[PDB]
Structures are given as C-alpha cells and as structure tokens.
Design an enzyme around this catalytic site. Structure first.
Site: not given
Lengths: 122, 126, 124, 114
Positions: D15-17
């Site tokens: 995942t990312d921010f």
C-alpha cells in the site's frame, strides 16, 4: 565519525498509515552503507576470479519515529568494528535533528554459491 | 501456544543481484505471517484502521532483531512461523521463523505497539 | 521541455538476473514525476493538505512502458520528465530513463487528480 | 487457452500513503500470475524479460482484499510471447495489462523458447 547521506521520501516508500513502511528503512540504510563505501573506495563484476557479494548476517533495528512523504532524510553510517571475515556498522536515520530509526548491522562477504570469503584492503 | 504456519512462494520481485532473496523482502514475508495471525483471530488491519474502536488504530514495529542464516532461492516455497510470546497491554512480542522445508533460513524477534492516527500509543484491546 | 532528475541504483533495485527489476523503473519514474512537481514549488504533502479546498491525490490511470536497455548496479541514472498534453481533468507525461546518454526505458503516463473519495477533480 | 487463475492477498507492504495499493506493486502481482501460469504448464543462465508493458489502472485494490489474477498467452512469436492479464477483486475489475516477454542470457542477447 558518521558519514552522512541524504534521501528523499517518495510515494513508493509509504504505506496506508501515512508513514514510511518499516521495511523501506532497510533500503535507506543500505544506501547509507553503499555511499559510505563509495566515500572510501568491482566485487560483483568477475574481477579476481569470482563474483563476491556483501551479505547482511544480522540486524537490530529500533523504530522510534516515522518519516512522512516528502521528508528529506539523513542517513549516518560508520564502521563500529572490523574483523577480517566480517565488519559491523552502526546506522541512524534522522529528519533534521529528530531521530527516527537506529540500527546495528553485521556484514559478511560471500561468493555466487554463498560460501564465506575473507575481506581485502580498506 | 502453537506456531501459526503460513506459506509464500519466492518470485523474481523478491530477489537481488546476488541470486537470492533480498534481505529486506524477508521483512515483507514476516509481515504476512503477523497479518495472517491477526486475521486468524479477528482484528484485521482494515478493522483497526476503520475507526470502529472509536479512533483509527495501526500496528507499529517498535523493535526488531533479525538473523539471516541461510538464503531463500527463486521459486522456493517458504514456511513462515509466527506466535505471540509476550503480551503487555500496550506492546506485544513475536517470534517469527522462515524455513524452506526443514531448513531454517531467517529468524526474528519483533516488538509491536498499537498507535492512533496521531502516533500516540494506545492500549491493546480484549 | 524535460525536467531532469538523477537517481542511483542500489542492490534493492536489482533482481536475480543482474539488472534493475522491471517494476523498480516505475519507482524511478514516480521520483521523476514527484521532482517535476517539486519544481512547480508544489508537492505531494501540499496537495494532500487542502490547497484546492480538499485533500488531493495524483493517480496513474494508464501507462505504456518500453524496456529497451538495462540499468546496472551503481549506475547513475537520469530521469527525464515532461508534460505532453492537458485535458483539464486528465494530464499526460512522457518520461525517459537514461544511463548517461543511453536510453534505457521510456514511458507514456496518464495522470488524474482525485479527492479522498476517489472522485475526479480538475487541475489547479 | 482459457485464463489461468491465481490469488494473492494485499498486505501493508503493498500500500501507499493514499490508502490504496501502490501502482508499481500490481506489476508484482501480474508477475505472480505469469509464474504460476508457467508452473501450471510444467516449466549461460536464461531469464525472462519484460520488453513492453501497457497497463490500465481502472479501480483501486485495498488492504486485505483477496485479489484474483487472470493470465493467458494472447500471441506466440517464437522469440517472444504476449500475455494479457487482469486483476480482479471478486467480480470487480481493477487493473488490466498487455505484456510482451522475451528470453535472454546473462550478457543480454536473445534466445529461443522450449
């Protein structure tokens, strides 16, 4: 002293909590170690007979504070003890003056088939 | 208190130029072990993050010790062993192992805390 | 025209075949896009704040990449990034990763701007 | 010549921010489909290389989704092959790819298939 090296936090570095993903610090640390080497003085290429690699044998990591997207980070690396078949490093990632992560790393040398080899002149 | 077992395969993504699994990817595999432990019981990362408990909550690695003994190869099928070894109401402690068959490759001691969206610590539930 | 940005290849970026793993070139392009943005005085954190009024995010809608030549361990790569078109909602970039003057990888990238909900929004 | 199926779970690492899966991580998932495809058919060192990739990022994957990866060979051409791939969350369509794949050895020169 500690050698200093800087690295930008990007999207690829983060996770769904908004912070740098914990494993990615190991990437930044690795950059610290390779730039430390560059700062002093080929193994992979073929060279004196065989491809050699640095290998991480042991790692201790303490994560105290997070980095955010866009943070310009400072990596501080130095050799804490040199032994002939292995060396030991001490590392810290900071954001300006704030301490984010600390590590003690053990590095040995291996060839293609994973056999230990001793270390050269440094 | 048994070790929970989880398997993962090694793909090209996991490897480095030295021919074997990159050292930081083992931490991804350890994370899979922990997440699968958490789901084996009930409180997944989406549930904690949702806000259901009153605020959004996230696990955080506080401290980790890894020993890299033997390398995993491309296409290896990995067994990941995870159990909680110490609870403390705001921190808990895990012992994780990575084997290929009967061969021990990597071992780890992990300390996990629970924090909110603001990074403030919170007590473990239930 | 092209904004330039330099990145170095570490062990992390490689795979068992000797060269940069194919997905990591995507990371390098994202760095190219982010630095491009950082040249406009703006950034990812500033978009996610609420300048437009709401919390904004860039999202990749489409991407065509051609992998021609490989990057080696310790190569110093140059990332070239420019905007080729706008649509007012959707914008396209052409991107290039070189070792010195050797073309390694090229991409055409379609980017949109969205809020926290995943709902589209025009460019400021 | 049907699609081959393979399932992968999304973890924190994926995942990312912005809450969703990082766009580059889908390439890892498509590669898992391609390898499991190969496994399913019973397959100087030689390595597969991606020559060309077109990807369409249509809907996001989230953490804990059990993704379904659909892979098939769309065209053969002796020195390379083409795969079309899709990543779904149940019935919902997330990401589509067309990929061209060659085989080379350690120096960088192309070779032949089985």
């Amino acid at each position: 002293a500690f050698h200093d090296f800087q690295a930008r936090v990007y999207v690829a570095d983060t996770d769904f909590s908004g912070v740098v993903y914990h494993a990615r610090y190991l990437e930044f640390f690795e950059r610290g170690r390779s730039e430390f080497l560059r700062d002093t003085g080929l193994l992979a290429s073929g060279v004196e007979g065989e491809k050699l690699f640095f290998v991480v044998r042991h790692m201790e990591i303490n994560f105290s504070r997070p980095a955010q997207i866009d943070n310009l980070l400072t990596i501080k690396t130095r050799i804490s003890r040199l032994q002939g078949a292995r060396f030991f490093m001490e590392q810290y990632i900071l954001h300006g003056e704030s301490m984010l992560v600390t590590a003690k790393v053990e590095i040995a040398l291996i060839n293609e088939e994973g056999k230990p080899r001793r270390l050269p002149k440094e």
